[PDB]
Design a protein around this ligand. Sequence first.
Ligand SMILES: Cn1ncc(NC(=O)c2nc(-c3c(F)cccc3F)sc2N)c1N1CCC[C@H](N)CC1
Length: 273
Amino acid sequence: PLESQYQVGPLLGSGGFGSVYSGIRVSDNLPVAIKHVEKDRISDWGELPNGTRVPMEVVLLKKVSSGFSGVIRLLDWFERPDSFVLILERPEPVQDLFDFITERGALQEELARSFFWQVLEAVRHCHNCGVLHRDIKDENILIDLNRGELKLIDFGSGALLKDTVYTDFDGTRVYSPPEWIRYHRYHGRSAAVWSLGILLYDMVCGDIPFEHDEEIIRGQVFFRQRVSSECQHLIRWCLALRPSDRPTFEEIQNHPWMQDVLLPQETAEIHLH
Ligand SMILES: Cn1ncc(NC(=O)c2nc(-c3c(F)cccc3F)sc2N)c1N1CCC[C@H](N)CC1
């Protein structure tokens, strides 16, 4: 009976996918988040190691929720008659990247370097666990304002990592690569690197580079803010039209702009405190 184990708080964010509320674990007052998703709106179903029909989001969360704090962890879950309920970790104090960018404007490169580096570690952690996020963007990134650590949220559009082609996509369109727009085909890792380049541009420019499909297909990047030559190169490299022309994760983290990253605690002391 979850209605007793947890105390439901206010509403953190809502959409057609479902609804997530703030919560507190009654036992130890652990701050949590309570996500509800109706079975009717579930398109991706998966199998649990014990052979249980469960939303794919639960499968993915289980596979990444061990040890590493780069992604928000699944603490527990329940099945209700018409819905599932997910109990998720919740940092305090916290704020998502989109509200942070909106509040502070384009980030300084030193700060953007630390943030982008942390999401690369989180996405790299997911892939190591056989999980593709497929909706990497500022709204899906959480900032622990005290520790300076970033965490990934919303695996509702994810899937199992595979090396063959994906023919479906339910993430954010303006973050989707040109091969999805044109051919409805893409490969996980190279598609992720594309969204990563959008994320980086959004970090240092305060806005997304493309809005329409024709802009995504063209792939020409104009900078509305002063951005170093190193960073512009990394961004345009991630945003290469040809997927095979995009960098690997190792190449992104070996890029010259990616050097001498600040530690998360150092990041918060300089930029967050
Ligand atoms: C779709 N979906 N699925 C899971 C989640 N959110 C979490 O899991 C989650 N959010 C947390 C949170 C927050 F987001 C904002 C402020 C304070 C918080 F504590 S704490 C935690 N575990 C989401 N959100 C929907 C809510 C709004 C998001 N910007 C977009 C995706």
